[PDB]
Swiss-Prot record:
Residues 59-241 form the Reverse transcriptase domain. It comes from Moloney murine leukemia virus (isolate Shinnick) (MoMLV). Mg(2+) 1 binds at D122, D192, D193. The reverse transcriptase is a monomer (Potential). Interacts (via RNase domains) with host release factor ETF1; this interaction is essential for translational readthrough of amber codon between viral gag and pol genes, as well as for viral replication. The chain holds residues 683 to 937 of 1738 of the full protein. RT is a multifunctional enzyme that converts the viral dimeric RNA genome into dsDNA in the cytoplasm, shortly after virus entry into the cell. This enzyme displays a DNA polymerase activity that can copy either DNA or RNA templates, and a ribonuclease H (RNase H) activity that cleaves the RNA strand of RNA-DNA heteroduplexes in a partially processive 3' to 5' endonucleasic mode. Conversion of viral genomic RNA into dsDNA requires many steps. A tRNA binds to the primer-binding site (PBS) situated at the 5' end of the viral RNA. This is Reverse transcriptase/ribonuclease H. RNA binds at Y41, D86, R88, P102, N162, P164. The reverse transcriptase is an error-prone enzyme that lacks a proof-reading function. High mutations rate is a direct consequence of this characteristic. RT also displays frequent template switching leading to high recombination rate. Recombination mostly occurs between homologous regions of the two copackaged RNA genomes. If these two RNA molecules derive from different viral strains, reverse transcription will give rise to highly recombinated proviral DNAs. Binds 2 Mn(2+)/Mg(2+) ions for ribonuclease H (RNase H) activity. Its cofactor is Mn(2+); Mg(2+).
Length: 246
DNA sequence: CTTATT
DNA sequence: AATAAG
């Protein structure tokens, strides 16, 4: 099965990803920025117990680490509890980058009628596959208490304004060669949502095998549960792709 | 929780 | 002078 043939490619069997070819990211600040330390609003025990096992898993995975930082932003006290960091004051102090992710409408314009066999993959915990340079880690620090200090991220965090664009650009670099090796396949990338299109069932099977092999080797992980493999009809970016339509 | 947006 | 999102 698709599961068995590519253990490394799937999130369910390959472990947490890590994009091994990508240098740890340095996050430039605006020219006038200085650190902001925002106090953590008190969190109820209910919310703290809800959040706690997620924090512990991330610590175990090395995605969070202890730190002491002059930066601090709050975790939401009401966040099915999973921690959500309010990074708006950090985002304001980080230098802007050009938004290079295409909007879905334009992206799908590059899908020709000749290619009507589809594979759709979504990468699991995509931002977390990208390492942050140690110099940039303190930027994203927050407080954590167990009724005691700060933690921060060692990977590109949720809620950071440039994460989608930086991920999209990193994956484009990592999939550049795949595109060159498979000139007859169509590959659409929208941050962590991928569409592979081919002219035949067999070509789509072979391409999908090569894409999974490649993604796994690079350190990314796709959702086996959500995967739509070699169908003439798929759901991609809120559209139903069918009979060359939409 | 905070904060931007008829 | 509810709303959606970090």
């Amino acid at each position: 099965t698709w599961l068995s043939d590519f253990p490394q490619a799937w999130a369910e069997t390959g472990g947490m990803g890590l994009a091994v070819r990508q240098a740890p990211l340095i996050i430039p600040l605006k020219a006038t920025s200085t650190p902001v330390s925002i106090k953590q609003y008190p969190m109820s025990q209910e919310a703290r117990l809800g959040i706690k096992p997620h924090i512990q898993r991330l610590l175990d995975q090395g995605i969070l680490v202890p730190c002491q930082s002059p930066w601090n932003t709050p975790l939401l006290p009401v966040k099915d509890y999973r921690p959500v960091q309010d990074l708006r004051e950090v985002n304001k102090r980080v230098e802007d980058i050009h938004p290079t992710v295409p909007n879905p409408y334009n992206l799908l314009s590059g899908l020709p009628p000749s290619h009507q066999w589809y594979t759709v993959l979504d990468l699991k915990d995509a931002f977390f596959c990208l390492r942050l340079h140690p110099t940039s880690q303190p930027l994203f620090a927050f407080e954590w208490r167990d009724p005691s200090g700060q933690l921060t991220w060692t990977r590109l965090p949720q809620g950071f304004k440039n994460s989608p664009t930086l991920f999209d650009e990193a994956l484009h670099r990592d999939l550049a060669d795949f595109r060159i090796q498979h000139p007859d396949l169509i590959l659409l990338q929208y941050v962590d949502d991928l569409l592979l299109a081919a002219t035949s069932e067999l070509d789509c099977q072979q391409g999908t095998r090569a894409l999974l092999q490649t993604l796994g080797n690079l350190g990314y992980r796709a959702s086996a549960k959500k995967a739509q493999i070699c169908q003439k009809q798929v759901k991609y970016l809120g559209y139903l792709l069918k009979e060359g339509q939409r």
